[PDB]
Every structure is written in structure tokens, then in C-alpha cells.
Symmetry: D2
Subunit: 219 residues, 4 copies
């Protein structure tokens, strides 16, 4: 393992949603062993975003999960080479997003992760919560981690809290591919809890916070 | 609330899977405040079952969940009238099951739940783990509970451990309908951990155990 | 050797529940297997008036009644007299879902009657959706896609209910067909369906149903 | 007023990634909008040889090229000169999934050319599935189901790739069509498609593609 308790984050995201192109960059940092990260985002091309910013935030690194010793940590072993993930996000009204992230060490040697993120979304109804920007936050969640074909899969049932109560459900299916041979975990869970801690009125500037911890289910 | 710490369970299940009809009955008991239940099942019609018994076990009562005080307990408030649920189970190879349970107090006044269960499954490939009986157990899981249309919904990502490693994924979507007006909870989670503790060779006699506890996600 | 006449009878019994609501329905009808046409008269004998839209049932009420061109292998007409069965799932877009099965054999008295043992199960329809609120008009005509897997026949169709005051409510079908004996297996092909309720009393306790169905192999590549 | 000639050109640029693998593809072709026929020549200009089956791309490479009978409203031919765009999702049965978009307008120099700006994105294809292992033969012909929602056009089709050594690999399409201006909206109808790769070099850097497409309104109820 090549991970410090204090680490930086740099990221660039390039995407379109319902055809609307956009670019976002972010500088942040976090504590890989506490499972905590912060990031400051800026919409550098394509703002104000027509859609709810919340659909983006999950694309903005499972290195930042506090793993107990008794569970193998696919992610912390993948470095310095890194890993990537690819994800699908099926919303219950037919809307869907794919996203990919390639995560590696900054080439200058320093304590920083570089993230290359692609994000694409189609079929959101013009009148649904995403297009109408009526989302409040993602609820905390529990991702389920298991192995297939010698790589790691994680599936989570996600839910957006809507304005005036009510939830809007989304199913995630992620694949994690380490850039080198690493020890493979047994079935386990990761609790996540992510929230937007600050944003300007049109979400051109957004600060994001996640806390994440792994476990192996009820005794 | 009309619930004792010690309570009996009686149940009858009637179903077909890939057209193969069957009847199962069960006597058991559990501790509604500890979130623990036991049941003894018998296949009284249609045995030996062509398919994996594991697909059945989740149909064999969210009253048996240990709820903390800070979370509203939809289920324990529904009694003595009871509640019902309806569920769908989407397996990743195309196989799918629906099930329903009507839960009420035994009519003789005693400390016993009566369960009327219907179970139907179609489209399991002749060569998949279910038809080939290659399942080992359901992994522990975390159901996600939220309200819609004044009733309670719970969705869980389930996974069967297969012989020689490997998992076989299933998505649950349950609806819970209390038979009277009850206080409605906020979004929360229920950890489940269920296992077959004993069975004869052809699964005509099976003993089942679940432990279940509610919580509200990572601090 | 096929055992099918151009005139054939249909007898059926359907037993189900939808959102927990139990019901039984029987039906007498007849059809013309080579023209791909069938008629049936249904009676709700237990559980009526039905809380849900009758439309969600009608598709469970036999692919023998499809007009097959000679150049397409007919899985169904070869399966007789032994018959076949099917299993189906029906995924509605609002989360509602139904499974159904049918076991189809020749009436035991030797006459030219198909006997249909049908089971039907529906869960998770929103209290306020078109199905529970009974706001459906009809199924649009459709094209089922037939293909082989694991030595049996699969057919998947995009279905759509027309709602009151326009608008459609989508459903995805996934059916499996299992012949009771070894039969010659078809290439990828299509079945057009067009089914409608031709008559019903106010509460749908009595319903007459009509389907016309024809197989084909998709648009010619040349103009 | 429609602005469509019977002879029309096609220019396109597609930019994507699949399983993270970036690529660019451009194409020159032409078609006959009233016969429902189109041709295109594709070049992989960046990212070749492609690790994945080229077949998963070809459907992104214009519903103007459908022969519409007079009795069916043609959403697409009315949308011009301004054009329309579509967004699509493609759900493969092994978990693989692709989204794509196309923005279709008239070439700015006034000539009779459609310009297509296409984006394509694919994730979660198993390393060992037909797509990554390049084991596809062709898409079977299909019937798309067209219906209206929220004042735009939706079309959903059950697609199927024929694999090497028989067997099919299913995919569900869900497309949305958005005209760039107010146009008359159609009733529920169908489009038959039949598309094939007519020519390619060994690594699919160069591919010629042909589609024939015709609309209809489903099997007559009468024999
Ligand atoms: Na903290
Ligand atoms: Na215990």
C-alpha cells in the first residue's frame, strides 16, 4: 500500500445530459483511512446546468472508504498504478446515466489522485425532478460488493429526496478494475453518506463531502 | 402496540415455479423486539422440489426487526389488524418471482401470527443455478425503506452465493400495506441476515433463521 | 405430422390474484388455427367485480392461433397432440408486474378442443395507476420477436396500453414456450398480434375477446 | 411544408468511449428519404482497431429515412430544415449498456446534406461477452414501436444480435425524438427496420452500412 492519511484530489469531468454538454473541474483532499473526502467543484463550461446537480455528485473514489482489517481492500492495494470504474445509473422514470473514472497518481510524484471522468445521461423526462431541478439530496446508502470475472462489482439502491418529501429511486451498477493484480475481497458492504455542503444559486460552484465505511453485514 | 417479546408463527405457502405446483406449511416462533425468528418448514405437496429452496426462504415478516426508538416502526403499529406485503424478485438471468403475504393474528386470540403466502416464479433457465439447485445461501443484506403513496416500500439488492464461489444477483421490490392508519417512517434501512440452519437431503423439511435490525445509515 | 384442423374449440380456466385480490375466470371459444384467428367468451366466476383493469388479463387468454407462412417453422402446430406450455412476465413501467403460465393440451375426450390451464399473478400496481383506477382502453397491436434459447422458444414483445384521454402505458413481455415433445426449431422471426375486447358488461364479469395473429420474417432488405 | 428531396446526402461524426476505450468515427453517405433507404461509408479515424464489436455502434449511424404511408403522420420529415435530435439507451442482457445521442440538422452551406453530431458511450460489458470478444454476426431486422409522450416521440425496440455459431444476444432500446420546432404528432405506429454491414476490412476500420426502413400500423384486425 502507497497511501498516506492525507491526500489530495484533482479531477476533470466532461459530459452531456439530454445532449447538454458541460465541463467541471475540482480540487479537494481527503483521508483515505478515515474514509472521508472533500472536493470543491466549478462548472467551467456549460453553466447554468439545465439539470439537477445531484445526479453528478456520485461520479465525484472508493479509496476513500475506512476498511476494517478483516476485509480485503481492493482499492488501496491498486496503487500507485490505480484503477478505473464504469457505472450505470437507472432512474425509475426511464432516465439513465453512464459514467467512467480513471484514477491514477499525479505524474509529478506528489500526494494527489488524478481523476478523468466521463458522464452521459439520456431520457430524463422534461417534467421529472432531474430536469425540473427538484432534488434535495441523496440519502445515505449501502453498496454491495462482490467479485465477478476477477474484478470487483458494487450495486447500490440509491434514492434522491425530492422537494416536499418523496423519494426518486435509482439503481447503480458499478464495475471496478484495478490496474494490477491485487488480492480479491469476499462479499461485503460499504456504507456511504454524501452531501452537498455549499453551493451558489445556479450550482456553478459546489462543495461536496462524503463519509464511507466498510463492513460485513449484521452479525 | 399489541406485541409480546415471545410470539408464535404459523404459515401456509402455495405456489408454482416454472409451472411446478407445491404446498408448504411452517410452525415457528420468534422475538419481535430482538428481531429474531425461527421457523420449521414442511413441503406437504409437490416434493422433491425441482428448484433451489433458497428462492423461497425470503417469503417465509418485518414485525421481526429490532427497531431503535428514533425510527418509526410501521409494522408493530399495524397490529392486531396486521398488514400484507407484495414482492417482486428479479434475477439477473431473466428469472423472476412474485410473492404476497397476508399477516394477521390467529383467530383464537393466542400469541400467534398467521401467514397466507402466495408464490409464483417464471422464466428460470433450465441450466441456471436455481433449476440446477447450485445455491449455497443468501448473503446478509440491507433493505432500503421509504414511503410512497402513504404505504411503505422496501427495495433490496440480494445475492445468492453459488457453489464454487460466485454470486447470483436478485433485485427485490416490496410493498407493505398496513390494515389500519399508522404513523409513517422516514427513510431508513433494515439489515437482514437469514440462513437455512438444517434441511433433509431433498429439502422436504427445512429450518430457517433470520436476524434483522433497523438503523438510519452511516453517521 | 400436424394434428390441427382449420376449425378448433377452446376451453380455459384461469386462477389468479392481483394485488392480493383472488379471482377465477373460465372461457369457451373457438378459432381457426391456420388463419391465425381466435374468439373467446369469458366469465368471471369468482372474485367479481374486479378491482383492476381487465385488460391486464387478456393476453393470458395460444400461439397455435398464428398464421405461419410455409417458409417459417411453426413450433406450436408441431407440438400437438401433446401440447406445450408457456411462462410469461409482464413488466409495467410504473413498477407493476405480472407473471402467467398456461398449460395447453388436447381435451381428454378426443374432440378438437384445446384445454388451457392458466395461472395469473400481479403485484405492486400503484393504488393510483391506470390498472387499479381502471383507465385502460386497449392494447395496441404488437410485434413479438421469436428466437431460440436452450432448445426452447423465446418471444419478447413491447406492449402498450392506450389510456383514457390519450397517452400510452408501456409493458415489456418476456415469454418462454416449451413443447411437450421434440419439434423442429424456428429461425429468428416475428409475430404480429392484434387483439381487442369486442364486448363486455359494465363491470367486466362477462367479456368477449378477439385476436388475429400472423408470422413473418421482417422487412425485406430490398425496396 | 416538407423540405426533403428523394436524393439526400449524409455527413456524420461520432465521438465515444466504450469500456473506457476512446474513439472517433466519421462517415459520408446518402439515402432516399421517401423509399426509406440509406447508405453510409464509415472510417475509424481515432482509436482503431476497436477492442469491441462494431455492431454495437451501427444503430447510432436517422428516422427521416423511413418510408411513411400517407395515413401515418411523419414526425421526422416535418422537422426540417431545423431538424431534430434523439437520445437512446441500449440495455444488453448481460448487463452491458450504451447511451447515444444524435443532433441532426441541414448542412450550413445550403446543399442537401444532413449533418449528424453523434455521441456514444458504453459501460459494463463483461470482458468475456460477445461484445468484447467480438462474436456478433448482425442485428436481426426489427420493429420499433412509436408512441407519443409529453409532446415528443418515443420509440422502443426489442433488438437482437445474432452470435457466431447461432444464438442471439438481446438488447432493449429506448429512444426519445425531439423535433426542433412544432410539428404534427403521430398516433401509435410501427417502423420495421432492416440494417446490415455490407462491407468491412479485417479490423473494422472501414465499414459500409445499409438500412431499409418502412412504417406501418400493425396487423389488420380482419383476416
Ligand atoms: Na467527519
Ligand atoms: Na441470536
Amino acid at each position: 500500500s502507497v497511501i498516506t492519511s492525507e491526500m489530495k484530489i484533482e479531477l476533470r469531468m466532461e459530459g452531456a445530459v439530454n445532449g447538454h454538454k458541460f465541463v467541471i473541474t475540482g480540487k479537494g483532499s481527503g483521508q483515505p483511512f478515515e474514509g472521508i473526502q472533500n472536493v470543491d467543484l466549478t462548472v467551467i463550461e456549460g453553466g447554468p446546468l439545465p439539470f439537477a446537480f445531484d445526479i453528478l455528485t456520485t461520479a465525484f473514489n472508493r479509496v476513500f472508504v475506512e476498511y476494517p482489517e478483516e476485509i480485503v481492500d481492493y482499492f488501496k492495494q491498486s496503487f500507485p498504478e490505480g484503477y478505473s470504474w464504469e457505472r450505470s445509473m437507472s432512474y425509475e422514470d426511464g432516465g439513465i446515466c453512464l459514467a467512467t473514472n480513471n484514477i491514477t497518481m499525479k505524474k509529478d510524484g506528489s500526494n494527489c489522485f488524478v481523476n478523468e471522468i466521463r458522464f452521459d445521461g439520456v431520457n430524463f423526462p422534461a417534467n421529472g425532478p432531474v430536469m425540473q431541478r427538484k432534488t434535495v439530496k441523496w440519502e445515505p446508502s449501502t453498496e454491495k460488493m462482490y467479485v465477478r470475472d476477477g474484478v470487483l462489482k458494487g450495486d447500490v439502491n440509491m434514492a434522491l429526496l425530492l422537494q416536499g418529501g418523496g423519494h426518486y429511486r435509482c439503481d447503480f451498477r458499478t464495475t471496478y478494475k484495478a490496474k494490477k493484480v491485487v488480492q480479491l475481497p469476499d462479499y461485503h458492504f460499504v456504507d456511504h453518506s454524501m452531501e452537498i455542503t455549499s453551493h451558489d444559486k445556479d450550482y456553478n460552484k459546489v462543495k461536496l463531502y462524503e463519509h464511507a465505511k466498510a463492513h460485513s453485514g449484521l452479525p
